[PDB]
């Protein structure tokens, strides 16, 4: 079980049961960022210090898809479902098999929508999703 080379052929992402397939080119196709800073250091006028830790365990994820990808169809159906009035979680979770690095969430929500650009060639479609809780998994294989 040697720590093999990194490859996109071992990263798996699941969005409400079905997989994510059509991804745009680039070094950043699925990016997750935390909500706020972990903490804040406050230093007074005398030199003492006090650290404050937040309770906000939330994250956002950005997915970049080609204009022709079944995940795009699934997401554009979910967006219309939200617009109609129905509101549900559709859990999303992704992981790398080489080092067990990644995370999972229980209830996400569509936060942004892509811009439909036609032009002369294909263009990215970026979706931004937001969770209320986000649990990373500890990479046990280093």
């Amino acid at each position: 079980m040697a720590m093999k080379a990194y490859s996109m052929l071992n990263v798996t992402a699941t969005l409400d049961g079905r997989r994510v397939i059509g991804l745009m080119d680039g070094d950043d196709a699925i990016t997750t960022s935390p909500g706020v800073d972990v903490g804040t250091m406050l230093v007074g006028a005398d030199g003492s210090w006090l650290f404050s830790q937040t309770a906000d365990k939330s994250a956002t994820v950005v997915i970049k898809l080609k204009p022709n990808s079944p995940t795009h169809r699934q997401l554009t159906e979910k967006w219309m479902a939200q617009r109609a009035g129905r509101l549900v979680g559709f859990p999303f979770d992704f992981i790398d098999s080489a080092s067990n690095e990644g995370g999972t969430g229980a209830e996400f929500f569509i936060q942004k929508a892509p811009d439909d650009s036609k032009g002369n060639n294909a263009v990215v479609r970026e979706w931004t999703i937001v969770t209320g809780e986000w649990t990373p998994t500890i990479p046990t294989l280093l």
Binding site: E77, K78, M80, A81, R83, A84, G85, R86
Partner: peptide, 13 residues
Amino acid sequence: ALDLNPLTGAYEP
């Protein structure tokens, strides 16, 4: 109708 299946209240165009 407003994009909601009456049978379940689930999504349907």
